[PDB]
């Protein structure tokens, strides 16, 4: 049967005898658990290191992909030569290992990266202390803990004990988690902050409503798990933030799924609470858990207020945005069809709208479409048969790549749809929709303008080109390849146009070059250029834009890649050709060796070898050695290095880490390192 309930439990036997165990067998020969300690208190290392001390909850709450300490007390001291046991974390009524819901945790000697395991770190008396490491992709929820001792007759498991139950949450602190956020300030605001502000009003008259998210208050966490139970969300997917965010975007509104909040706009709000009355999320969600029925009522800002609590409570970093002059598209044409005329016209435009943004990687999308994802629980339009919206990649909306799931065309139309006064046309307005998008700033109640994340500035040619690309989701081919990109050196970006027609064309285009992480999260735009090229008939044209090294070297990170947007419009036919590609920089590295005894009080030779990576001629090569405690900083110059030729630098020194760096005239800031013990 489907296993989609954290509340439901199966019963795990305490004496899993196998075969025909003879009568009179003596199970006292084997270990049994007298006590288990989880150090669950909110001052101890577990909750503090896992950023869960805030939760008003007396049970162990950890975040996945991180180590926490437990202690198991046995009847006699644990002996590895004769004892074999494992820890188990179980969830649901139908737990299987291959479904992620039965998790065996073997007692190992060394914790492995991204694998479940427990390592002993203390053995005093009859007690062993364990550092347990969870998988950075583990299901999020309330697990049941067991200690299982293996015997030749079966497994001796502990009895059910709800005091050892453990919540495992999303970990925005673990670089192996899809919700990883490499910024403590951003983490404290988008995860640990339980209050905030929401903006509303008009574009020129802006009001501020404060909201108490209260994700750490008693009952809220269990409620969020209940919200997922009520959705019948299969447990095997509750570790995927894309599924958790999309299920939330449906379950917060009461339509078609008996969700948390009922939307009403009719100025009456009979037999319920007016939307303007709510000041936080705790009372809505708790009433949902108590009554087990939807709460009345809510509107745009209240849906986001509760959705924000749901996301932060589970661990997904989340913020609330406000779109002023948000458009409502009814016929999915990405236009505001205006006929005035109230009978034929069905497209509306709100003074403002509020939806949520959730921080996650998008492994289901190409590289570059991670980071902030737009999610809207407010019921506006159907999506695949339900009232939900997102996660839509804000990055995909900016360049009009609305073909990437989910519901990107809708969110694009909300922020940058043109007005079409329509058989016959008349006027076309292109600046009215999405005048301003805002969100609460870090460290204050100010207003961070984030309009530039969803769309290019109205007026600029990239805005139109992005829009016309979105509307698209004359015998001309278009492609671009990156010309031998080496870290620390200028490289060429060659846009190619092939015209197979007998006509002469004019092409307007823009180029967007971006640094993205290895996971696929965007960092920044380091180059943006618009350009115009003419295409003679039966020709090929290779316009090559030069990316200078100084343009991107300032914002690079470990294993970062380059994401390029190139959208070109055929002016004569108004066609739009759009490509997006990712490339990893060919990064040179410095090999550092140490020969000799590496003790203090004696000389040792540090050998630095560098290989010329370019087909060019390197001149004025400066190599710098740095290593505090080993050798004072020094520099070896090299007036010339021939192509594909290797250089070696020896440096004696009497003494920790060593860092080397090369910089020439055509290649700068290429590094190497080596950890040395002394």
């Amino acid at each position: 049967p489907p296993n989609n309930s954290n509340a439901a439990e199966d019963d795990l036997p305490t004496v899993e005898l196998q075969g025909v165990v003879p009568r009179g067998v003596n199970l006292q020969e084997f270990l049994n658990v007298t006590s288990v300690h989880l150090f669950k208190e909110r001052w101890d290392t577990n909750k503090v290191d896992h950023h869960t001390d805030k939760y008003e909850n007396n049970k162990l709450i950890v975040r996945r992909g991180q180590s926490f300490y437990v202690q198991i007390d046995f009847s006699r001291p644990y002996d590895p030569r004769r004892d074999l046991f494992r820890v188990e974390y179980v969830i649901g009524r139908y737990p299987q290992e291959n479904k992620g819901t039965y998790i065996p945790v073997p007692i190992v000697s060394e914790l492995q990266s991204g694998k479940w395991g427990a390592k002993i770190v203390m053995r005093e008396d009859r007690s062993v202390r364990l550092s347990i490491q969870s998988s950075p992709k583990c299901i999020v929820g309330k697990f049941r803990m067991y200690v299982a001792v293996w015997t030749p007759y079966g497994v001796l498991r502990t009895s059910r004990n709800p005091e050892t139950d453990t919540y495992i949450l999303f970990n925005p602190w673990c670089e192996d988690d899809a919700v990883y956020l490499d910024n403590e300030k951003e983490r404290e605001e988008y995860v640990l902050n339980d209050i905030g502000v929401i903006f509303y009003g008009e574009v020129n008259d802006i009001k501020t409503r404060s909201w108490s998210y209260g994700q750490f208050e008693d009952g809220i966490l269990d409620t969020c798990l209940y919200v997922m139970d009520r959705a019948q969300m299969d447990l095997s997917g509750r570790g995927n933030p894309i599924k958790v965010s999309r299920v939330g975007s449906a379950m917060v509104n009461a339509k078609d799924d008996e969700g948390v909040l009922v939307g009403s706009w009719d100025n009456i709000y009979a037999y319920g609470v007016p939307p303007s009355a709510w000041t936080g999320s705790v009372d809505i969600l708790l009433e949902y858990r108590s009554s087990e029925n939807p709460v009345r009522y809510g509107q745009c800002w209240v849906f986001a207020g509760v959705f924000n609590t749901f996301l932060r409570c589970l661990g997904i970093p989340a913020r609330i945005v406000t779109n002023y002059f948000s458009a409502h598209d009814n016929d999915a044409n990405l236009q505001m069809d205006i006929f005035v005329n109230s009978k034929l016209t069905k497209d509306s435009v709100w003074n403002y709208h509020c939806w949520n943004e959730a921080w996650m990687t998008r492994p289901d999308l190409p590289v570059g479409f991670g980071g902030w994802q737009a999610v809207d629980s407010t019921p506006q339009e159907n999506s695949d048969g339900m009232y939900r919206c997102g996660p839509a990649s804000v990055q995909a909306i900016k360049h009009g790549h609305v073909c990437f799931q989910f519901d990107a065309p809708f969110v694009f139309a909300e922020v940058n749809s043109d007005l079409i006064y329509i058989h016959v046309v008349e006027n076309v307005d292109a600046t009215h929709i999405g005048k301003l998008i805002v969100t609460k700033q870090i460290g204050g109640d100010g207003m961070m303008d984030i309009t530039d994340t969803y769309k290019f500035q109205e007026g600029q040619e990239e805005e139109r080109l992005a829009l016309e690309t979105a509307l698209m989701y004359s015998n001309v081919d278009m492609d671009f390849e990156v010309e031998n990109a080496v870290l620390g050196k200028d490289f060429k970006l060659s846009i190619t146009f092939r015209n197979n027609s007998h006509n002469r064309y004019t092409i307007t285009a823009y180029l967007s070059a971006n640094i993205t992480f290895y996971t696929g999260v965007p960092k920044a735009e380091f180059k943006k250029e618009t350009f115009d090229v003419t295409l003679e008939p039966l020709s090929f044209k290779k316009e090559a834009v030069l990316i200078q090294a100084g343009e991107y070297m300032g914002q690079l990170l470990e294993q970062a890649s380059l994401h390029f947007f190139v959208t070109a419009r055929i002016n004569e036919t108004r066609d739009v050709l759009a490509k997006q590609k990712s490339t990893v920089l060919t990064i040179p590295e410095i090999i550092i060796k140490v020969r000799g005894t590496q003790v203090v009080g004696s000389d040792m030779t540090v050998i630095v070898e560098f290989t010329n990576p370019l087909k060019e001629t390197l001149r004025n090569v400066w190599v710098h050695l740095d290593g505090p405690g080993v050798t004072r900083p020094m520099k070896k110059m090299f007036r010339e290095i021939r192509p594909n030729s290797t250089v070696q630098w020896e440096e004696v020194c009497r003494p920790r880490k060593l860092i080397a760096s090369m910089s020439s005239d055509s290649l700068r800031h290429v590094y190497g390192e080596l950890d040395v013990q002394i």
């Binding site: 745009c300 800002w301 505001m336 205006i338 016209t345 509306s348 709100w350 003074n351 007005l419």
Partner: peptide, 6 residues
Amino acid sequence: XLILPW
């Protein structure tokens, strides 16, 4: 959240 005249 008001609907706004076109």
